[PDB]
Amino acid sequence: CGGAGAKCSTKSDCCSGLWCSGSGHCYHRRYT
């Protein structure tokens, strides 16, 4: 998975917990 601070195109670019800020980098909404 992506992760907190990982570049993303969608939130699916990270594990369910790190959400994609628009299309930049995932933020730790769920923390983990």
CSV table of C-alpha atoms in Angstrom, one decimal:
chain,number,residue,atom,x,y,z
A,1,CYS,CA,0.0,0.0,0.0
A,2,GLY,CA,0.9,3.7,-0.2
A,3,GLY,CA,0.8,5.2,3.3
A,4,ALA,CA,0.9,8.5,5.1
A,5,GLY,CA,2.7,11.0,3.0
A,6,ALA,CA,2.8,8.7,0.0
A,7,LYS,CA,2.0,10.1,-3.4
A,8,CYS,CA,-1.5,9.0,-4.7
A,9,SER,CA,-3.8,9.2,-7.7
A,10,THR,CA,-6.7,7.8,-5.7
A,11,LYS,CA,-7.3,6.7,-2.1
A,12,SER,CA,-6.9,3.2,-3.4
A,13,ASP,CA,-3.3,3.9,-3.9
A,14,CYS,CA,-3.0,3.6,-0.1
A,15,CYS,CA,-4.5,1.1,2.4
A,16,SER,CA,-7.9,1.8,3.8
A,17,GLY,CA,-7.0,4.4,6.4
A,18,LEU,CA,-4.7,6.7,4.5
A,19,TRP,CA,-6.9,8.9,2.3
A,20,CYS,CA,-5.7,10.7,-0.8
A,21,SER,CA,-5.7,14.5,-0.6
A,22,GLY,CA,-7.2,15.2,-4.0
A,23,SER,CA,-4.5,13.5,-6.1
A,24,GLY,CA,-1.3,14.4,-4.3
A,25,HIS,CA,-0.3,12.4,-1.2
A,26,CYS,CA,-2.3,10.3,1.2
A,27,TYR,CA,-2.9,11.6,4.7
A,28,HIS,CA,-3.3,9.5,7.9
A,29,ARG,CA,-7.0,10.1,8.4
A,30,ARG,CA,-7.5,6.7,10.1
A,31,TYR,CA,-3.9,7.1,11.3
A,32,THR,CA,-3.4,3.4,10.4
